[PDB]
Amino acid sequence: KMFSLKKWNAVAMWSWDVECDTCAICRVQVMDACLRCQAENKQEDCVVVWGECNHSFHNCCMSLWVKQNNRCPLCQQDWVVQRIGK
Amino acid sequence: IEDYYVGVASDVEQQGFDPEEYQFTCLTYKESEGALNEHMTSLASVLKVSHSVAKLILVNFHWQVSEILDRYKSNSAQLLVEARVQPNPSHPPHHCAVCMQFVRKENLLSLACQHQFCRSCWEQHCSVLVKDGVGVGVSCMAQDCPLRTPEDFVFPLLPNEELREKYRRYLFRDYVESHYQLQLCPGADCPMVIRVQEPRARRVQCNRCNEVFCFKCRQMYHAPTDCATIRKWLTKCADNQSQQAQAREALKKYLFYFERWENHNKSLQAAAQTYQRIHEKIQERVMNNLGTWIDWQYLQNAAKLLAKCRYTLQYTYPYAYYMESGPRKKLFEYQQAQLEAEIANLSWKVERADSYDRGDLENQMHIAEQRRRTLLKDFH
Amino acid sequence: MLIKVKTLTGKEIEIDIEPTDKVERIKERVEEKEGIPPQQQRLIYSGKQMNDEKTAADYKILGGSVLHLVLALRGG
Amino acid sequence: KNRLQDSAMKLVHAERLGSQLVIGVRESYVNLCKLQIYRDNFEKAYLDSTERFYRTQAPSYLQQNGVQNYMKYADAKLKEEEKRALRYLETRRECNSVEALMECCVNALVTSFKETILAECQGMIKRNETEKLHLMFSLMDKVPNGIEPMLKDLEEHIISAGLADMVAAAETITTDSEKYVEQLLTLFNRFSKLVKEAFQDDPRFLTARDKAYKAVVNDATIFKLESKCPELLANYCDMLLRKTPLSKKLTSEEIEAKLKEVLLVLKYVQNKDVFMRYHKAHLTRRLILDISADSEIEENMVEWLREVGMPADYVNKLARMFQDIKVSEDLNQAFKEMHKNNKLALPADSVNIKILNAGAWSRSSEKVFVSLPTELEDLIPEVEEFYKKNHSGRKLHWHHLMSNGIITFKNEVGQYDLEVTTFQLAVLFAWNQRPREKISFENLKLATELPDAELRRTLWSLVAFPKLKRQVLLYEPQVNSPKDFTEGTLFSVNQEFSLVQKRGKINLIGRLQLTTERMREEENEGIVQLRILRTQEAIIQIMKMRKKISNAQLQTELVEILKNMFLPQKKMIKEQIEWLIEHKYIRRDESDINTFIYM
Ligand SMILES: [Zn+2]
Ligand SMILES: [Zn+2]
Ligand SMILES: [Zn+2]
Ligand SMILES: [Zn+2]
Ligand SMILES: [Zn+2]
Ligand SMILES: [Zn+2]
Ligand SMILES: [Zn+2]
Secondary structure (H helix, E strand, O other), rough: OOOOOEEEEOOEEEEEEEOOOOOOOOOOOOOOOOOHHHHHHOOOOOOOEOOOEEEOOHHHHHHHHHHHHHOOOOOOOOOEEEEEEE | OOOOOOOOOHHHHOOOOOOOOOOOOOOOOOHHHHHHHHHHHHHHHHOOOHHHHHHHHHHHHOOOOOHHHHHHHOOOOHEEEEEOOOOOOOOOOOOOOOOOOOOOOOOEEOOOOOHHHHHEHHHHHHHHHHHHOOOOOOEEEOOOOOOOOHHHHHHHHOOHHHHHHHHHHHHHHHHHHHHHHHHHHHOOOOOOEEEEEOOOOOOEEOOOEEEEEEEOOOOOOOOOOOOHHHHHHHHHOOOOOOOHHHHHHHHHHHHHHHHHHHHHHHHHHOOHHHHHHHHHHHHHHHHHHHHHOOOOOHHHHHHHHHHHHEEEEOOOHHHOOOOOOOOOHHHHHHHHHHHHHHHHHHHHHOOOOOOHHHHHHHHHHHHHHHHHHHHHOOOO | OOOEEOOOOOOOOEEEEEOEEEEHHHHHHHHHHHHOOOOHEEEOOOEEEEHHHOHHHHOOOOOEEEEEEEEOOOOO | OHHHHHHHHHHHHHHHHHHHHHHHHHHHHHHHOOHHHHOOOHHHHHHHHHHHHHHHHHHHHHHHHHHHHHHHHHHHHHHHHHHHHHHOOOOOOOOOOOEEEEEEEEHHHOHHHHHHHHHHHHOOOOOOOOOHHHHHHHHHHHHHOOHHHHHHHHHHHHHHHHHHHHHHHHOOOOHHHHHHHHHHHHHHHHHHHHHHHHOOOHHHHHHHHHHHHHHHOOOOOOOOOOOEEEHHHHHHHHHHHHHHHHHOOHHHHHHHHHHHHHHHHHHOOOOHHHHHHHHHHHHHHHHHOEEOHHHHHHHHHHHHHHHOOOHHHHHHHHHHHHHHHHHHHHHHHHHHHOOOOOOOOHHHHHOOOEEEEEOOOOOOOOOOOOOOOOHHHHHHHHHHHHHHOOOOOEEEEOOOOOOEEEEEOOOOOEEHHHHHHHHHHHHOOOEEEEEEOOEHHHHHHHOOOHHHHHHHHHHHHOOOOOOOOOOOOEEOOOOHHHHHOOOHHHEEOOOOOOOOOOOEEOOOOOOOOOOOOOOOOOHHHHHHHHHHHHHHHHHHHHHHHOEEEOOOOHHHHHHHHHOOOOOOOOOOHHHHHHHHHOEEEEEEEEOOOEEEEEE
């Protein structure tokens, strides 16, 4: 048949399957990396954690917050890690 | 290789900030008067009324033409009553009620209230009021009467030119004050007026005397707070358990914020010496044969950024002191502490440092600016 | 006003109308051109089925616009 | 004591015009009294004699021989007076007599006539008077606070000359990026050589040169009024870095030197963010097409950009892009190794994938409507589920503007192959059926689901390629603007298109688009509704024609029936089958549920 395909180069873009698209601690969009990681150049090691209250944050920011106190900064409920991004 | 780069100026623009952004138009002393005259002419033509009553309408309604038209269409009778033009709806005396002396009919002037008084008393009252700095506040002598004397009535009662000129100056000042888009410069005899589309509480700078002040209230630029909290905070700074223990705890909490307020105030007030020191530390680097003048230029930008970030911090502490204790206050204070730490880091890297690397310093600048924007974003 | 109406097979029918023409009269133009009855005629423009009571200009049809003619399902 | 010092001046007066006798007297008064008496008498008289003599003499020479010779005379007189001071004055006993006399002499011979020399300074900056400019700079440096007018005049001359040259040469400079960079480099080199020759690279003059060049580069006279300099610089960088013919002949070291010169110029621009945006777009195109001349040069380029002082955001973004390129290079090999066995219609050796971050690269959660072929719709779910294996909590937004590929074209003359984007791919696939047939501009808008503007641009790029003489698609109502396409325009495939080589390869992707308009949802919804109605009508018609037909023949007969309207999709076919079986239009066979019955 006329106009058959020989070679293709697909391109796709990935993003975190989250909501509100904002860490709400540093107010940086989730698809990016946190400021400290971005400055220190340790990229791809900055991930997203979820919670039983259905709130998403950076792993680094949430680690600092739990080092401060154990409660979600958005809803005043005890922080229980539901799942980790990767 | 030549037709390739034709339409690159549009494709690259995949996506285009400044949370405190503002468009102030700069007007001189006469341009403002011209604008006032134009507005008064338009209103007088529209409502088929004289100039003085149109000015009274504009003053009473803050020079908002649309609201004036809407209220005129709704009910014209109450519009003039509220603007103190005509008395509320709900034969010559030949005897002044304030000097008790019989006078001729022609010398017995009166307003729409039909409160008649002799011409000499009118002149005395207008003279004393204009001497007392009273502008649009001239009203009828009769007690409880809210009616005000229009411009075409006051002027013939002013004998000399200096009283007329003072009356004009006070009228202009009151017109600028009552206008919802014009504000006088709070400077020392600065003859300037700032004009803007809509009134808000943002940063304005008079280009003539380089004064920065809040628009809605002619005070220093309080960035995150409002015009009421900062007033009471400045007023205060000048002068289970028992109540006394609560008082001690309140004093401790007040000190916990006042110490940081004073720290940042003094640090900002001592910035000229920092600028001079950085200039000298650049001169010492450039006279010796290493680099040129263009290489050591980012240190001035660093100093400006630190000054801006310190100014932003200084005004967030009264904001956080007058807040309801909940989930929001803790996050705000956490972000505030983060920004404080990063300012300390950058200040150490700029002032008390020997070897300057541009990549690290630029990263610090970006982080500090992002944190300042994050702190200011939530409210504005 | 000279518009264009499309069928399934790809055959094209050309008709001339007026801006004030009611779309029904467009249907009877279709029948004086082709032998398909009005009850089996569904006319669709821009993905929208036209109701019987309407003027052509009310559907924002222009000169060289193309109309789509879809048969009624149970009627055919 | 006064008698001897008085007669010394008479001897000095003779020597000024044209030793031990004075030295012995100096020593006698130095040690007679510890230098206070020498600081009172003797020293003052010597300074007074020098001042009187030179105030009487120097102006006469000035009006005799002019400033050009007067400067040389002043230099010679200063040297002679310094030698006389060192030979006739106490200096070895820690005495400031030499410094005081030098101060008096310079004040009497330079400060007294500085304006007359500074006027000549303003005069002689041009026409290359360096040989006397050096002498003047030597003269004026001794006087405190004397060289600032020289700096001001040099800055003004540099600014004026640069602006005048830019305006005079603005014909071939505004539209060309090579000439702009060449002119900037020539100006910088000329003025740097001038400074080095005239003032032996004094730091103050270097500062003045930098401050003047900063204003020169940032000039609003390019569009006879905006900021276009960063765009031209980025275009030059792209030419140096891309696989253009200009960089084909140059060597790596020469390219690196040219880049270093470009970055040296780049240190003076004011809005570096615009340049970073343009460079990021160019690098995106280069990385996606894989047409880089040298990758290590690009990595050193981003390192140098970080060193120069670019904003910290775009540099980190570029580093992230390079890291993502490496990660995707690994991922593609992993996917190919997985897919090597279960061969599909597309062999695993001719398919590439690139999963990239959505923050560093284009950030847009926009929807693009394209009717993809069957070979591409059977590949998205496979890649999606493969990515959902090792990674959790991650989405995938497929990019259709950046995707590209190679197809082959079969004429009656010969077989070729092309390099096309997804949009041109969808437009070209409309001719798979109805090969030698005309298609209107409106049937295309339905068969490809593309919006009006994108369809117009793609069709214009497909029928009006600049370099080529022969083309693939031709249309009858010829026009010189894509905006004048009418709904009655007819397109057809050029059966006589050729390169007369029977085989060859040409490129149709020139600057793949990185941005499109907001495709309105109303038009796509209307197209979808019309497609649903048409496929329902076709299915019911074929059921009416034959009341008993299996499922396998259904798709073939539907393709044959729907060939002049559009190509039906399997998903929509199944959905419409369900929607019609639910409304009793057709009936499902009881024995084996694959055949349908009409009633
Ligand atoms: Zn975060
Ligand atoms: Zn991180
Ligand atoms: Zn929560
Ligand atoms: Zn009286
Ligand atoms: Zn009254
Ligand atoms: Zn001012
Ligand atoms: Zn205020």
